[PDB]
């Protein structure tokens, strides 16, 4: 076996589908050569590490093995490491083309201690002629102010439905798997902008049931079906909604967090009802979510959420 | 003298009940030799740990102690242990092994974001030389990157058949007699948790059996585990509904004091009883559910219990006027 999130990883900067302007800027940087220190921030699973990896590859060509120092969460990143190894790598002699430079790729920089990030300022400022730093973090708020001041911030937005759909189309074209539009829509729904999670769910569905159909996708994701959730959030009488929640969703052992998240994601795409009622139902669902997350996942909370949703949909 | 929670533990795969859907799949997986990282998540008292230890035993034979690394919750694992111990165990090659090593983390949902990132990176780096298994009670508390690396398996609580079969088995290996309504009370109070059943059974065995042959009634099983009683619940409900304020308040205080019950159990039982009533107005149900959920959320933060009890009484009374 081989994970499809690892076999179909983009190795060139052009294969990455997503934010077009940032990718164009990175392509121009790789074509020119003058690359500055950069912090890449964004949500998980939208191609942050892969982006800087393809950037370093296209920049260094055959020198990736000698002019790239990658540090992830597995390696030790303390005071001694930053003071010794990074410093000795920055001063390391290397003959490169006039535009290229050495690259230090620090993945998950938001996990590095403040003291360790402190000892990198002068290291990255004094050796700016032969060393360029590339940090990759999920939260740009945990990086100290001098570091954020020294490098340019590149924000990555969540993936739209069209780009994920095109990537899945390319994957199924190259993999020769049978599918339907309903299964693709279900995968886009359950992926909520996570390309890696989308590819993983597609591979799981293919390996489990072969045919990519909405039923198989919602069976392998082990989440409440959006159809029955929409039926619960649109009943005319509150009694039928409570019965649907009791017999069909609560008896099957579904987690309250999963039920609330599915109701949230269904109310967002419920194009039938108006905008104000959608926003208010989303507010109520989020209040119920906050109540559940605070240590009380009682069925009474979901019952009250349904009661409020019904009262708001009737008023 | 070993506990029934530990004595009746399934030592192999065929002795876990109510989880056939996952048992057949894991059997096929260990028979095809394509065992990936497994994320066993679900409510407690279901059989995750027993299933995984039985699988590890069936795979490794006598090499269990040398080829299986059992790791637990926080245990002072800030960033150090996941960085050194797990990494070495995944990197250290055994001396006479033909295969891969297994590291099983129990209730690993309590790890911090940095620890979860370190763990997922370790899994990514050594996915070819070892396999990982993570146990969890809530799959939402884990980083969405760790989920996309392994295969998930939800452990839906045991149905009635598995629990009654296990009650039969524990009655075979122990001289106890159980009343027909005793097993009904047990399955109603268990909520599909075998651990609590095996905990409550030994307690009643220890306390009640003077000649080791008595009959366990609903009274003792309700008293030991500290659970409400349906008759008492209905009496409190009727007293709140029909009688006036002084009498209903006094009855509620007497019930919640002379038996040692908490307001959370009273509220959930009251709403469970009210679920099936044929009330005329729907605004009644709306107000009832809203106010009861508000009272429960406020109780969750530890207020003055008398005030929330009076508020429960007032809400129940004021909702039934339409």
């Amino acid at each position: 076996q081989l994970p499809w999130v690892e076999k179909y990883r983009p190795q060139v900067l052009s294969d990455i589908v997503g934010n077009k302007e940032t990718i164009d800027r990175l392509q121009q940087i790789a074509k020119d050569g003058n690359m500055p220190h950069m912090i890449i921030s964004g949500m998980p699973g939208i191609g942050k590490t892969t982006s800087v990896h393809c950037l370093a590859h296209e920049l260094l060509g055959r020198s990736y093995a000698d002019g790239v120092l990658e540090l992830n969460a597995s390696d030790d990143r303390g005071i001694d490491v930053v003071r010794n190894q990074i410093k000795h790598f920055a001063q390391k002699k290397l003959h490169l083309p006039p535009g290229k430079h050495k690259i230090v790729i620090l993945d998950e920089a938001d996990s590095m201690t403040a003291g360790a990030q402190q000892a990198l300022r002068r290291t990255m400022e004094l050796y700016s002629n032969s060393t360029r730093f590339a940090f990759a973090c999920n939260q740009s708020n945990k990086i100290i102010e001098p570091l954020q001041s020294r490098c340019a911030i590149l924000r990555y937005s969540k993936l739209s439905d069209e780009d994920v759909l095109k990537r899945l189309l390319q994957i199924i074209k190259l993999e020769d798997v049978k599918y339907t539009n309903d299964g693709l829509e279900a995968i886009i729904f359950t992926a909520e902008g996570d390309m890696r999670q989308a590819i993983n769910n597609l591979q799981s569905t293919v390996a489990g049931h072969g045919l990519v159909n909405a039923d198989n996708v919602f069976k392998i994701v082990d989440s409440p079906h959006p159809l029955i959730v929409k039926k619960m959030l649109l009943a005319s009488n509150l009694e039928d909604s409570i019965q649907i929640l009791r017999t069909d969703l609560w008896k099957k052992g579904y987690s309250s967090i999963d039920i609330v998240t599915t109701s949230f994601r269904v109310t967002k795409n419920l194009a039938q009802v108006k905008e104000s009622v959608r926003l208010e139902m989303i507010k109520e669902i989020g209040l119920t979510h906050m109540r559940i997350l605070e240590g009380v996942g009682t069925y009474l909370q979901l019952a009250s959420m349904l009661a409020k949703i019904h009262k708001l949909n009737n008023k | 003298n070993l506990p029934w929670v530990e004595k009746y533990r399934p030592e192999t795969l065929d002795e876990v009940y109510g989880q056939n859907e996952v048992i057949t799949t894991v059997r096929k997986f260990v028979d095809e030799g394509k065992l990936p990282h497994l994320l066993f998540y679900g409510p407690p008292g279901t059989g995750k740990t027993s299933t995984i230890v039985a699988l590890a035993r069936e795979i490794y034979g006598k090499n269990y102690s040398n080829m299986v690394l059992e790791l637990n919750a926080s245990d002072d694992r800030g960033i150090d242990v996941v960085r050194n111990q797990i990494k070495d165990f995944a990197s250290t090659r055994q001396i006479f092994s033909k295969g891969f090593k297994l590291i099983i983390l129990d209730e690993a949902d309590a790890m911090t974001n940095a620890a979860q990132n370190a763990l997922r990176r370790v899994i990514e780096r050594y996915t070819k030389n070892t396999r990982f298994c993570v146990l969890a009670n809530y799959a939402h508390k884990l980083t969405p990157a760790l989920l996309s690396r392994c295969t998930r398996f939800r452990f839906q609580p045991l149905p009635q058949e598995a629990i009654e079969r296990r009650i039969a088995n524990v009655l075979v290996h122990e001289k106890l007699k159980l009343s027909p309504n005793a097993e009904k009370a047990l399955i109603e109070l268990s909520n599909g948790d075998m651990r609590r059943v095996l905990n409550v059974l030994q307690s009643c065995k220890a306390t009640l059996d003077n000649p080791d042959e008595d009959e366990i009634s609903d009274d003792v099983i309700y008293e030991c585990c500290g659970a409400p009683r349906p008759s008492d619940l209905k009496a409190v409900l009727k007293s709140i509904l029909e009688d006036d304020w002084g009498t209903a308040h006094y009855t509620l205080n007497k019930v919640r004091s002379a038996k040692g019950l908490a307001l959370i159990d009273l509220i959930e039982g009251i709403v469970k009883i009210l679920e099936d009533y044929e009330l005329q107005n729907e605004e009644t149900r709306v107000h009832l559910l809203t106010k009861l959920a508000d009272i429960e959320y406020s109780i969750s933060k530890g207020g003055n219990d008398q005030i929330q009890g009076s508020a429960v009484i007032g809400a129940i009374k004021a909702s039934f006027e339409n």
């Binding site: - | 905990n199 220890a206 207020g303 009076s310 007032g314």
Partner: protein
């Protein structure tokens, strides 16, 4: 303190909880005393009965040599439970003298009391499991706690569970009368039940309150009976006269008068939030208000309590509650 001069030293002096003392009295005559898991509210008689059992089974000579007391206050880390507690569990029992054998049956095991088991680390209890089970022949434990959920299940199987019920207001009056007689403290008529109601459940609070109030009234050198007012003034509760003043002001009045009165109250009056609880008790126990009134009174009091339970400002919430309860 009178809580120490009059602590129960024998198993008969404890009269509040009787359902647990009788079975241990039946069992002490046998050397198979299992490990114990006592759970219950604070100030019910846990340590009293524990020390009483220890005293009546071992005697004053061996109180220190073979009975250990460890609390949450002292260090109890994994290192301690693996070095000190473990060695004390494996140390051979001492030789009791002939005087002890002549008055007390010396059991072939030790007594280690680790009270307050709620706030123990899971690592510590998981280690103490094996620290306790393998040495059951020469060591037995008794863990004290308030909530059974804090201790892990394997530490509750071998240990028999004992719930110390909250003492009732009917059997606790005799002990208060007893402690009143053994000290020649002159009390008034209707004060004992007020002390019991103020310190409901926790009899220790009532004992300390009575002691402190008697000692504070003795300084006056009057020798008069100790009234209910000087008792309720040390518990932090709002007096009844100012409470009646608040109720009369809120029964019929304008916004300005209520605001000025609550300003004066927060300025110089009692600065406790128990006024809400007293208003709750008064309005609910009263028999001159209608049902539609009680509904809204209870709801408003619950809302005010939920607001005040978030570290908010007392003055604003109290004024809002008073205005809302006046608008009805």
């Amino acid at each position: 303190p009178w809580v120490e001069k009059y602590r129960p030293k024998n198993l008969d002096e404890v009269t509040a909880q009787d359902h647990a003392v009788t079975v241990l009295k039946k069992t002490l005559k046998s050397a198979n005393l299992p490990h114990m898991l006592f759970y219950g509210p604070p100030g019910t008689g846990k340590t009293s009965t524990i020390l009483a059992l220890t005293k009546e089974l071992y005697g004053p000579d061996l109180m220190k040599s073979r009975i250990l007391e460890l609390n949450a206050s002292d260090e109890r880390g994994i290192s301690i439970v693996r070095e000190k507690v473990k060695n004390f569990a494996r140390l051979t029992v001492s030789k009791p003298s002939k005087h002890d054998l002549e008055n007390y049956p010396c059991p072939p095991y030790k007594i280690i009391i680790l009270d307050e088991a709620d706030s123990m680390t899971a690592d510590a209890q998981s280690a103490l499991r094996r620290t306790m089970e393998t040495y059951s022949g020469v060591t037995r434990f008794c863990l004290i706690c308030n909530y059974v959920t804090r201790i892990i299940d394997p530490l509750a199987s071998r240990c028999s569970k004992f719930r110390f019920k909250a003492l009732d207001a009917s059997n606790a009056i005799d002990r208060l009368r007893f402690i009143s007689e053994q000290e020649n403290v002159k009390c008034d008529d209707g004060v004992l039940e007020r002390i019991l109601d103020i310190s409901a459940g926790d009899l220790r609070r009532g004992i300390t309150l009575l002691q402190s109030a008697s000692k504070g009234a003795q300084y006056l050198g009057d020798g008069k009976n100790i009234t209910s007012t000087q008792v309720e003034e040390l518990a932090g509760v709002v007096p009844h006269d100012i409470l009646i003043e608040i109720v009369e002001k809120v029964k019929s009045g304008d916004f300005d008068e209520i605001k000025k009165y609550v300003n004066t109250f927060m300025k110089s009056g009692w600065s406790a939030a128990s006024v809400v609880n007293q208003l709750h008790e008064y309005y609910i126990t009263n028999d001159n208000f209608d049902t539609n009134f009680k509904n809204q009174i209870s709801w408003l009091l619950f809302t005010t309590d939920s607001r005040l339970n978030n570290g908010t400002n007392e003055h604003i919430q109290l004024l809002n509650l008073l205005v809302k309860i006046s608008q009805l």
